[PDB]
Nucleic acid binder design. Structure first.
Ligand SMILES: [K+]
Ligand SMILES: [K+]
Ligand SMILES: [K+]
Ligand SMILES: [K+]
Ligand SMILES: [K+]
Ligand SMILES: [K+]
Ligand SMILES: [Mg+2]
Ligand SMILES: [Mg+2]
Ligand SMILES: [Mg+2]
Ligand SMILES: [Mg+2]
Ligand SMILES: [Mg+2]
Ligand SMILES: [Mg+2]
Ligand SMILES: [Mg+2]
Ligand SMILES: [Mg+2]
Ligand SMILES: [Mg+2]
Ligand SMILES: [Mg+2]
Ligand SMILES: [Mg+2]
Ligand SMILES: [Mg+2]
Ligand SMILES: [Mg+2]
Ligand SMILES: [Mg+2]
Ligand SMILES: [Mg+2]
Ligand SMILES: [Mg+2]
Ligand SMILES: [Mg+2]
Ligand SMILES: [Mg+2]
Ligand SMILES: [Mg+2]
Ligand SMILES: [Mg+2]
Ligand SMILES: [Mg+2]
Ligand SMILES: [Mg+2]
Ligand SMILES: [Mg+2]
Ligand SMILES: [Mg+2]
Ligand SMILES: [Mg+2]
Ligand SMILES: [Mg+2]
Ligand SMILES: [Mg+2]
Ligand SMILES: [Mg+2]
Ligand SMILES: [Mg+2]
Ligand SMILES: [Mg+2]
Ligand SMILES: [Mg+2]
Ligand SMILES: [Mg+2]
Ligand SMILES: [Mg+2]
Ligand SMILES: [Mg+2]
Ligand SMILES: [Mg+2]
Ligand SMILES: [Mg+2]
Lengths: 53, 116, 110
RNA sequence: CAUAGUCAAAAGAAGAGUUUGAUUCUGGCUCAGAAGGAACGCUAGCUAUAUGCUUAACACAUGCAAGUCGAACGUUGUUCUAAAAAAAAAAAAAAUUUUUUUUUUUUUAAAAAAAAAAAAAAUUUUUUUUAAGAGUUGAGAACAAAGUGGCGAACGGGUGAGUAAGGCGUGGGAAUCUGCCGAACAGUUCGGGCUAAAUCCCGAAGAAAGCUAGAAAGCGCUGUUUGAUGAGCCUGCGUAGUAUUAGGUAGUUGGUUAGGUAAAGGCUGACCAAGCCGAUGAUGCUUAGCUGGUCUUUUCGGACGAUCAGCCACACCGGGACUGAGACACGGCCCGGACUCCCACGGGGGGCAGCAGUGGGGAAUCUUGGACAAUGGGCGCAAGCCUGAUCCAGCAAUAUUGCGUGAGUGAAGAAGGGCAAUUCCGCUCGUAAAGCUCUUUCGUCGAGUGCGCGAUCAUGACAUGACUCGAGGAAGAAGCCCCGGCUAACUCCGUGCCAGCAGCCGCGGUAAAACGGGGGGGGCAAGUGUUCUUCGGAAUGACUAGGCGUAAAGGGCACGUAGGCGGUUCAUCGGGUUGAAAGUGAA
């Protein structure tokens, strides 16, 4: 299985909303995110507004 | 603390050659010796990693301490200047107060003698 | 001994794990020194699993000598904070697999 | 450039019936709402997640819940066998033989290869017996069969009897210890004892302890510096009711000196002084584990402390200490008492408030299940072994904004039931049913793959599950309360202040919308009503947010203690106040 490792904590912050992410493939190598993974990161973030409609 | 720092200072690693590198020996009493040598090799890398983490945390702590040491003397200089301004402001207020106090003192002696 | 271990969350037939630094005599779901991260054992919609860890805190506890347990060794290695466990150098148990492709939305064979 | 940037943290505020011939006010009683570790009535299809002795901290049959280590150490007590490495696939009943190279010893400086009995050959060969207290018998198997020893049984799990401050919440302090885990620096020398040995005990130096060329630079121990985690002790603040309980204390309050503790200290022996607590409630009595939190509520409060998590106390009832880094120790020891069971009658044994389970009490609360596959723990170098911790199944409408009980069509307005100046298919049950077309969620049945997945290097109890495919026929699945007003919903028959209903006002005395039945209707819905408990309504203890002339309520009037409250200016300071930063506010 692949994993999506997230760097939690105030020092691992990718910005206002969450922490930075990488992959670390089952063979021992790690890569940055793809576009699908980047969409997942964007769509799972919290949003600073009341629920509209 | 930013996206760019974790982009540029992350070791992304290569495919490890240690995975699946076992060969089948011919003697069971030999295989357990290599098994224990692998177990012995794991503990050395752990203590090497332990020594590497000790260095970084101490290097963080000394920088934090020198940052606090800089901030403290900057605040001490600013507070000494504020004290120096306020002290002379109080001094000139105390010197201007005495003339009205003296002029108020004379009339009280005057109005008490007239009642006397 | 200070240990990095997993504590069970979630509900019946739905596991979830929290990586916590605890004293060794504490209960499984009881007192802890710190909470260090989470781990989802179930596979997500992207075909992979999820993990988050507090890197500075795990560095501190490893530097002062905490002993990770046997799944935490695996997860810290895949996170790249520890050397590999000794028994991962052995290669998987091969064999035939049911490689018939399945349509992802309906669960029937394509 | 971008895995950037968006500044969200609530919602929640209702009235009605009843004192009078009628009115306004004061003032209670009752109802509409939400909820529970609930009980009972009637009636019930499914899946999942939670919950389930609140009473007798009453007594317990049966089984399991703490073991592990031969890599610390001897003992005896079984078994079968008499140098190493490499090759053997063809011609004239077959497991072990044939060949080469190193290497150890014996026999006569090159070569060769224990005793007793019977047989043969020229010392050896075939068979047996005793071998191995024996001029070193060479290798392997389990020794569990009993022990010594090390680590762990101080963790995990249960209950809330006691405790009103020695506890708890929150923040601190100095006068201490700290096995296992991380990192340095140095050693691990020699005698004796336990039938036999030792990492078991005694001694000497300085403290000790050795194992392994099967684990030889790999484990372990000792001393000294330290990190980390726990523990002992002390403390500021906060934390029930009662004055129809006003005095309590005598090691009591302090001082000196000794002893003790790892550690401050009346912790206590002797001596000295008379202090200490109290109207800001000591002491006495009653009740109670505390917190994070649960239910309710336009913020506040009130009731609760059940599940889960943190701290504390307890282990049949009282009193002790040993071992140990850590206990005054739930399934360890000693002593006393009550109960209980065996006895061969001398005496021994026992503590389910651990998981199941049984009597008893009660309105009422569960299986004498499966597995260590995941997580956590103990022992072990590991291999692995234990684990009623846990994970997962069983029972119970106990709870939860879930799902289903069909979707269309149908007028012979069928039969039947009820009502009717007995009007309009006479009105209604009623398109309702029967019948016809469609689709099978939940459940039923039959099969198939399973590194689908919880788990990876491998390890799957759950799993007779889940997933996929197929068979089918609307087929298996709707009740509970109410219909005088409050309060949505009306008629016939029987009864006759009787039977009876009822939360409040009240109905029943020959045409009862209020009792009981037929029919019809309303509200919820796998539920729905009755009882108990909590909050709201209740501004009905009023901080938010009430009162005391005539309705409950100004002391008969003063003086004063504590307390509460209370003029002006100028200056100083920084305890309260206030702004920023850091630590903390567990999950
Ligand atoms: K009192
Ligand atoms: K606490
Ligand atoms: K006792
Ligand atoms: K296990
Ligand atoms: K019920
Ligand atoms: K049906
Ligand atoms: Mg009156
Ligand atoms: Mg009992
Ligand atoms: Mg033992
Ligand atoms: Mg215990
Ligand atoms: Mg329990
Ligand atoms: Mg409790
Ligand atoms: Mg009590
Ligand atoms: Mg209110
Ligand atoms: Mg309370
Ligand atoms: Mg209970
Ligand atoms: Mg012990
Ligand atoms: Mg001692
Ligand atoms: Mg014990
Ligand atoms: Mg017991
Ligand atoms: Mg029990
Ligand atoms: Mg009974
Ligand atoms: Mg384990
Ligand atoms: Mg171990
Ligand atoms: Mg429901
Ligand atoms: Mg089905
Ligand atoms: Mg089936
Ligand atoms: Mg699997
Ligand atoms: Mg099932
Ligand atoms: Mg009405
Ligand atoms: Mg009548
Ligand atoms: Mg009625
Ligand atoms: Mg009636
Ligand atoms: Mg109120
Ligand atoms: Mg009033
Ligand atoms: Mg007044
Ligand atoms: Mg008066
Ligand atoms: Mg009066
Ligand atoms: Mg002023
Ligand atoms: Mg001030
Ligand atoms: Mg702050
Ligand atoms: Mg919290």
């Amino acid at each position: 299985w692949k994993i999506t490792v997230e760097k939690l904590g105030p020092q691992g912050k990718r910005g206002n909303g969450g922490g930075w992410k990488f992959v670390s493939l089952p063979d021992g190598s790690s890569r940055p995110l793809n576009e699908v993974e980047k969409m997942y990161v964007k769509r799972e973030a919290p949003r600073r507004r009341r629920k509209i409609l | 603390t930013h996206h760019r720092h974790h982009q540029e200072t992350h070791s992304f690693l290569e495919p490890e050659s240690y995975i699946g590198s076992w060969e089948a020996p011919k003697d069971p009493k030999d295989a357990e010796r290599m098994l224990a040598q692998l177990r012995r090799d794991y503990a050395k890398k752990v203590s090497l990693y332990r020594k590497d983490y000790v260095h970084e945390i101490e290097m963080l702590r000394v920088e934090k301490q020198r940052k606090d040491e800089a901030r403290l003397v900057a605040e001490r200089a600013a507070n000494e200047e504020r004290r120096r301004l306020k002290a002379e402001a109080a001094k000139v207020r105390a010197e201007e107060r005495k003339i009205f106090q003296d002029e108020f003192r004379k009339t009280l002696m005057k109005e008490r003698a007239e009642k006397l | 001994v200070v240990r990095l271990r997993l504590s069970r969350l979630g509900c019946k037939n739905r596991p979830f794990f929290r990586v916590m630094a605890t004293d060794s005599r504490s209960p499984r779901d009881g007192k802890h020194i710190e909470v260090l991260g989470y781990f989802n054992p179930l596979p997500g919609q992207d075909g992979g699993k999820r993990m988050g860890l507090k890197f500075d805190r795990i560095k501190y506890w490893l530097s002062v000598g905490a002993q990770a347990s046997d799944p935490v060794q695996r997860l810290l290695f895949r996170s790249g904070l520890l050397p590999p466990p000794p028994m991962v150098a052995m290669g998987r148990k091969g064999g035939e697999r049911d490689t018939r492709p399945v349509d992802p939305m309906t669960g029937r064979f394509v």
